[PDB]
A paper describes a structure:
The cytoplasmic adapter protein talin controls the ability of cells to adhere to the ECM. Intracellular binding of talin to integrin adhesion receptors activates them and initiates the formation of adhesion complexes, that upon linkage to the force-inducing actomyosin cytoskeleton mature into larger cell–ECM contacts known as focal adhesions (FAs). KANK proteins (isoforms 1–4) are known to bind to talin, but unlike talin, which is ubiquitous throughout the FAs, they localize to a belt region in the periphery of FAs. KANK proteins share a common overall domain structure, each with an N-terminal KN motif responsible for a direct interaction with the talin rod domain R7.
Author numbering:
A (entry chain A), J (entry chain A), L (entry chain A): 7 to 127
B (entry chain D), F (entry chain D), H (entry chain D): 1 to 26, 36 to 51
C (entry chain C), E (entry chain C), G (entry chain C): 1354 to 1659
D (entry chain B), I (entry chain B), K (entry chain B): -4 to 128
The structure:
């Protein structure tokens, strides 16, 4: 017999969010502009194709601080980082463009297409 | 999820019920059953 | 004379609250195998259950419907028991997490389920051959103890899968097969001796219970050995100070909810009493405040966060 | 005249339902490719490489091990010798796949290792199985 | 205004329950000199007394008869006090029985009976020569303190028969004979100074109290010395874990019986109250359950049986 | 020694009274004031 | 439906009694900076206040006057809180006074007032630039947090005057001047941006909050360092035995007074209830007896007298 | 400062109030604002 | 016809009232003849041989001494030097005879040794005597 | 003065029964057929003339196990052993002969005569 | 006839109101003249001679120091090095004069030393000042 | 600013009385007739001009026991000693002369004049 724990996948992500909220084993600091963002490399690579290419690079796998491009909006990246740990993408009547632009910078094409669908209506 | 009415106007304090709700999430919610992130090859 | 068959729910629920209260007095070994995050999930889910229970207690006792009142009383009881179990488990993890604390291993066996299973066959020995319990009754006298002999092999099996010494693991498997094969010899005694039982084969049916009882006595004697005895952990002074905010809020939750059910008992007998509804309102706030302080303390005192 | 082009007003939240499953699947792909595996779990001379964050998200024991400061940055973690290697292997695969493979033979080592790793939900599932067979 | 002279039994009984509760908070030295089997006998006999008391509480408060209600309240109080004393004594013996525990010797003297006996003569010094308490009153002013001086020699005598140092035993016998012979010199002051007491010999009657007061002060100062100071035992973690089931059941018995007497107080004022009788029924079960768990725990946890 | 009747049908739980009785002894009882066992010489 | 706006005093007072009860569970570090004689003065003065409060509770709830009832309930609450604080402080001093005890230093900072002050600016960051809290509201959004930034400099200043390391004292003064000068740069943002605020200078008003928030985050991170962490004292077994009579009488005072206020709540809703007045009379005696035993224990157990 | 009267004849025990009074002092009191003791030169 | 010869039916229990007294008397005869005396109690260079089971059945102290595992199989038990030999002798004879010989002189050592041996019923009897003379 | 504690004799026997029920200082195992019976030698000698003759024998005083004759009924001996510690002799309509036979085997003549009186009625 | 000369009957108590102030003033004169100063308090190489009984009557810390038996008969008492000498000087002068001199500069060392000496009434006064300026 | 703690002077004297009632740091025993009186030298010198002259004497500053004149009334001295620590002078219809005589022996002239005023009425 093979038992399927349907709620297991959501519990792991929630516990991973508990570890980030408590700075437990956060192994990287994503610096955008002047704001600090600590997270787990494994979660960043699983969600963002950009961060996957960064930490798969052997010369950049053991980096403690990652400084993004200055044009990246900090609040837009924060909504994406919160989406990686909570499966919730919060879009406002203003930040929707900053979230859409930062999503394609992080190579998260499915989040980009979702913002393309929402900007239509 | 905050207070319920008992006879003679008294209340039952359910502030802990709302305190748990604020922890679980915290206006329109939109569902998306499509794939959210890129799939990693083996 | 009325409401007599609705009070039993209140009487039994309070006893269950008195029993879980025993977990908070001195945590020195874990209550279960819950993760600390699992304790947060258990506390938050039981709070969702306790909220619906309290609303059911008030709205039922307001206008009769005593069966639903007994369901809400029993629901609020089991929800508070899950509160205490997760709070005591979290309080223990916070205590041992201190770098100057110690660890307390749990016993490899529980010498209580084997004691009740021993009385299931001890009081059944003379109950099948004395001027008190005669023949015929084999459907009940055999099944009520066969469930305990099968649970004996199940509990003895998992007990071997945890011990490091193969000497004990070999003995647990041996002792589990002794209770099993002795019952297997009793299967033939149940196969026959149905209608033709005027001492036609009862001398051999008891002859199968003799190795069934002496092997259970042999297994119970081996359950009280070294290593199997549980060891309490040594919580440091700082570990005791960090776990108490979870323990105090859990103690206050039980003592405040017990008075709520006690007040709900009087209002279930007669709801027309504004002073009694005021006392229930006062206990409902102290209950909610104790839960909020309990959840907040468990969240802040994660073994990882400073 | 003129007209304004705005995507409405207020707030909105998009719920990616299968996002949690995609993260766990991608994390399992990283383990199968040995990508950023930060710890190796030795169970009776049998090694198992995984991610510390995933072990803490599923096991209450590994949470206690890596929240310990003097054991947080440990490369190798040696479990107790009484832990069955395949029993831990079934649980580790369950952490990354949400699949618990239970038979009438391995359920002994699975539940025994489940309570050792402090996985109450798995322990209750194994107890449900035994109380049904 | 009524039932005022029946409430005093309830008020005083609860205070006695608050006092014996102090024994259970931290047993570190024995309450008395009871054998462990004597604790079983005391608990079982007091349960027989408490049963008859509770039936008397209900049947009296049902239909007046407040004098019998006060007797049942006082009887239930003293029965619960015997429960706590035997439970605390048994809990201590279980604690020190652990091979990793320590022993706690009791004080050779009790500096409380000597303190009250000191005030029996201190407040009596000025009470026999000031504008407040004049002459004549010698039947009361002498007898109420002579009982304490005789009890002083009795307590000081047995205190010498327990100390190992003959230096203290010689001093206890000496200090006991000082309070005795000083009172013996006061016997002559009582022999005379009856009617011819207009300062005819009162200057010598006080001259016999001067060595009577300074010898009592000398004995009280010697009661607070080394060795005489009690030492608490060091209960091991396993010893603390084994004694708590007796302590918890004893704490629950007192807190549940206190609410029973408190509910019995309200029902004694007015019995026509079905909700109040329901609360009493709820407390009666928690009391009975606490006693059953207390007796069962004391039987299983004998210092000899495993 | 098990339950006593209070007004309005409620009970007083005396199960501890019967629990002590089961410990003290545990159907007709017969007394015998004669010597029970042999007497040992000095 | 009535007496609803008078129950809040009873509900909040009991919560305050539940909070001070947390001080008595395990004193390992002092509650405040009271002299032992100051504890006697505080207990005796609060007893004078509690007496007038209880008389006000009864006479008000007797005949309406619910506003005065709420004042007497709140007065009795704060008087009992002063009882517990002085009793816990005295109990600690008696414990550490034993020659075989240890000392427990209090934390140089309190990481709770800085946490609430952090949320005063954290929840105010997005509350000044999102579709929820717009402009105009600068009288409230600035003053409610400026009181906490000024209290931040006050708390950080006195925290430096207690540390021995000049490295921390220099950093505390530096961190206090960082929150001050960053707010001083915000003074110019309040000087302007009054009516001409259509993004005319709001980009610079937030530019003054950026060093105001990151310096507060820098100060809060430094508050959770070594030395600043409080250390619990090691009370000897004899020290624990000497302090318990003060702790037990203090615990009994709170649990008895809580039931008094709880009974006073029911009598405030409806005074015509002789059984309820009897329960209040019973709790009033246990309260008075607990206070007398508390004051007597604190007087006898001075750290100087034997 | 000893007992106060509640409805239906019951009392509030204020013996602790009188117990504090006995500690503070313990019949006519006479005030004297004059200097009580000698003053010591510098 | 025929007839059956049975001693009735049901159950019956015969209560030997003086059985407890005969056992204690026989146990005292064994002590006087030094039969199976398994311990010797030394009280200030004065020996007293008795039975361990009888000492534990009467004294709460000796119960604590022989329930102690590392003191269970002890041949000699030396009491504290502050224990009066004749005071313990009166108590030991009381254990086997139910007779407590009390005078105005020895009652000091009897009650002091009674509470040392943890014999509360004897202590209360001595306290009753003193509170009456 | 000589104070007579009337209840002392019954308290000693009851405490001796508490020690047997807890296997405290039980120094002999009386094996009848295949059933084990642990008791105290001093109580066995005080009640049974047979056991008195066994443990008074110098070559049999320090025996840990005593195997009775196989013809002895185990349940009959159990009623006698329980009588030694509880002063209660339980007789049924069946076991009365096994108790009477085992009593005379243990040389307990007074218990034998009591069974002779009961078998008459 | 005759007549009796008695100062009435009963009792009377004379209350010297300013007696407490005269005692404290005389005690301060003894300190200024170094009369029976039984201890010297060193605060960072700065000595302060005073009376032990006055220090215990005002400071809860000095009460704890001299009620300690192994520290009761101490001639010199060295405070912690983090104690400001002038902050302790203002408090010591307050003990003998009932005068607390507070400014916007020294109030830091006064309140910090007040809670070190366990003077809650002085701590609350300094906290009132800061919460008003 | 100079804050005046008006209640400070009475609190010091009360605490000094607490120390005497507990024999805390009592450094002298004043023996009158056959009665012992322990007190603090600093309080005795502050109130009594006699004791000031005694302990200011370099050859009598470190005396543990001070024996007063036998003619001094012990109860009269006790009322004066209690007045030094409690600011309360208790005068009866009898002891008033013993208090007045002992006051001038202790060189407490203000207490003497108070007794002179009270003896007039």
């Amino acid at each position: 017999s093979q038992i399927q724990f349907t709620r297991h996948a959501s519990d792991v992500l929630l516990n991973l969010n508990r570890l980030r909220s408590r700075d437990i084993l956060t192994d990287v600091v994503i610096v955008v502009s002047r704001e600090q963002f600590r997270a787990h490399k494994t979660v960043l690579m699983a969600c963002s194709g950009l961060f996957y290419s960064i930490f798969t690079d052997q010369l950049k796998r053991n980096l403690s601080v990652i400084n993004l491009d200055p044009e990246i909006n900090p609040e837009g990246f924060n909504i994406l980082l919160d989406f990686m740990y909570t499966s919730r993408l919060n879009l406002r009547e203003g930040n929707i463009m900053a979230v859409m632009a930062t999503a394609m910078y992080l190579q998260m094409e499915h989040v980009v297409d979702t913002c393309r669908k929402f900007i239509k209506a | 999820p905050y207070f319920v009415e008992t006879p003679y106007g008294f209340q039952l304090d359910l502030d802990f019920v709302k305190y748990v709700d604020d922890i679980q999430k915290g206006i329109t919610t939109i569902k998306e059953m499509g794939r959210s992130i890129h799939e990693i090859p083996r | 004379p009325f409401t007599k068959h609705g009070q039993k729910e209140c009487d039994n629920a309070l006893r269950q609250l008195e029993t879980v209260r025993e977990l908070l007095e001195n945590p020195v070994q874990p209550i279960n195998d819950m993760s600390y995050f699992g304790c947060l999930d258990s506390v938050m889910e039981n709070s969702k259950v306790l909220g619906e229970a309290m609303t059911g207690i008030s709205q039922n006792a307001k206008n009769g419907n005593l069966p639903e009142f007994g369901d809400a009383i029993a629901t609020a009881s089991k929800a508070l028991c899950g509160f205490t179990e997760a709070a005591a488990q979290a309080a223990y993890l916070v205590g041992v997490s201190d770098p100057n604390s110690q660890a307390g291993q749990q016993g490899l066996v529980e010498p209580t389920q084997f004691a009740r299973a021993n009385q299931a066959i001890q009081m059944a020995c003379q109950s099948l051959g004395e001027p008190g319990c005669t023949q015929a009754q084999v459907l009940s006298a055999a099944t009520i103890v066969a469930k305990h002999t099968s649970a004996l092999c199940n509990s003895c099996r998992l007990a071997s899968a945890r011990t490091a010494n193969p000497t004990a693991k070999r003995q647990f498997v041996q002792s589990a097969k002794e209770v099993a094969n002795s019952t297997a010899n009793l299967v033939k005694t149940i196969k026959a001796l149905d209608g033709d039982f005027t001492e036609e084969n009862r001398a051999q049916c008891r002859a199968a219970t003799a190795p069934l009882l002496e092997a259970v006595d042999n297994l119970s004697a081996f359950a009280s050995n070294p290593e199997f005895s549980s060891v309490p952990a040594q919580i440091s002074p700082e570990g005791r100070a960090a776990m108490e905010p979870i323990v105090i809020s859990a103690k206050t939750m039980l003592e405040s909810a017990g008075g709520l059910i006690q007040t709900a008992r009087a209002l279930a007998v007669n709801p027309r009493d504004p002073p009694r509804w005021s006392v229930l309102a006062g206990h409902s706030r102290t209950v909610s405040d104790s839960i909020k302080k309990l959840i907040t303390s468990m969240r802040d005192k994660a073994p990882g966060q400073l």
